[PDB]
Structure 1
């Protein structure tokens, strides 16, 4: 397979819960193992913006997402916000790529400063120290200078800052097509196959 076998997928409390659920679904369809983390605020976002009725506790959440996605037993792990016995908490874990989608400005801040206050933040700290892939998907507008400095610091350290800023150059017809644009770029970044977004100009030879 091309790309990572295991992805840590963290959802934090920015608007755009649809992006994180669609990415989860694509990762599952690509037979990847997902270590799923979700913040309390992201739970409130998902309740507000979607009709997904996500259970609160990790085992119930795991059972629910496995069914929602059509996943295999064991394919989605769920870990709670203080579960330091989970693989993402240590750099001695097997290597995973990590994506924070969506990424709140508060989570962006914590990652940029090294605040390590829950498993999402620690997981990101471990990805950086181990030089494992780290993709942040912020959703905010305007971005203040606070936000921008935090994104620049992490981009300079090799994190990929991938704003939830979809393109329109494949004539999107629905909200889903815009969601899938962003998801496709995340999968592209990770080196995971996707067929939602064609390869630009692949068939163009000259002019």
Structure 2
């Protein structure tokens, strides 16, 4: 297969729960193993922005997401926010790619400073020190200079700063089209196949 076999998918409390759920769905359909983490604030965002009734405890949450996505047994692992025995907490784990989608300004800050206050933040700190893929999907407007300096620091260190800023150049007709645009960009960055966003200009041979 192309792209990583395992993805750590962390959802934090920025707006855009639909992006994270659609990415999870696409990763499952590409037969990838997903290590799923979600912050307390992100659980409130999901309840506010969607009709998904996500259980609060990791195990109930794991069973729910497995059925919601049509995932195989053990394909989605759910780890709690202080579970340091989980693979993402150590660089000696098997290599994963990591995506934080959505990525709150608070999680952006924690990763930029190295706070490691929970498993999501420690997992990102591990990704950076092992030079494993780390994609951050912030959703915020305006961006202050605090936000921008944190994103610049992380981009300089190899993280992919991929804001939830969908493009319109394929004439989106629905909210789902715009959600899929951003998810397609994430999958492209990871090297995972997707057919939601065409390859721009692939049939374009010489200028008109």
Query: What's the TM-score once normalised by structure 1's chain length?
Result: 1.00
Q: Matched residues in 2 for 1:142 and 1:57: separation?
A: 34
SS of the residue 1:131 aligns to: coil
CA drift at 1:123: 0.1
Q: Number of paired residues?
A: 207
Shift of 1:40: 0.1
Local SS of the residue matching 2:36: strand
Runs of 4+ in 1 over 4 A off after TM superposition: none
Deviation at 1:43, TM superposition (A): 0.1
Deviation, 1:22, is 0.1
- Cα offset for 1:42? 0.1
- Distance in 1, matches of 2:71 and 2:116, equals 30
Cα deviation code 1:90-112 (max 9, x no counterpart):
00000000000000000000000
> What corresponds to 1:44 in structure 2?
44
Query: Following the alignment from structure 2 to structure 1, what is the Cα–Cα distance between the partners of residues 92 and 158?
Result: 20
Work out the CA distance in 1 between the residues paired with 2:107 and 2:23: 19
Structure-2 separation of matches of 1:26 and 1:156 = 29
Equivalent-residue separation in structure 1 for 2:43 and 2:118 (angstroms): 15
Can you list the C-alpha shifts for 1:63-87, whole angstroms capped at 9, x where unaligned? 0000000000000000000000000
Please give the per-residue CA displacement for 1:129-180, whole angstroms capped at 9, x wherever unaligned.
Answer: 0000000000000000000000000000000000000000000000000000
Residue in 2 aligned with 1:119?
119
CA-CA distance at 1:118 after TM superposition: 0.2
Q: For structure 2, list consecutive stretches of 5 or more residues without a partner in the other structure.
A: none
Where does the alignment leave 5 or more consecutive residues of structure 1 unmatched? none
Per the alignment, in what secondary structure is the counterpart of residue 74 of structure 1? coil
Instruction: Give the TM-score normalised by structure 2.
Output: 0.99
**Matches of 1:129 and 1:15 in 2, distance apart?**
28
Give the superposition deviation at 1:39: 0.1
Which digits, 9 at most, give the CA deviation of each residue in 1:7-27, with x for residues without a partner?
000000000000000000000
CA RMSD of aligned residues (A): 0.2
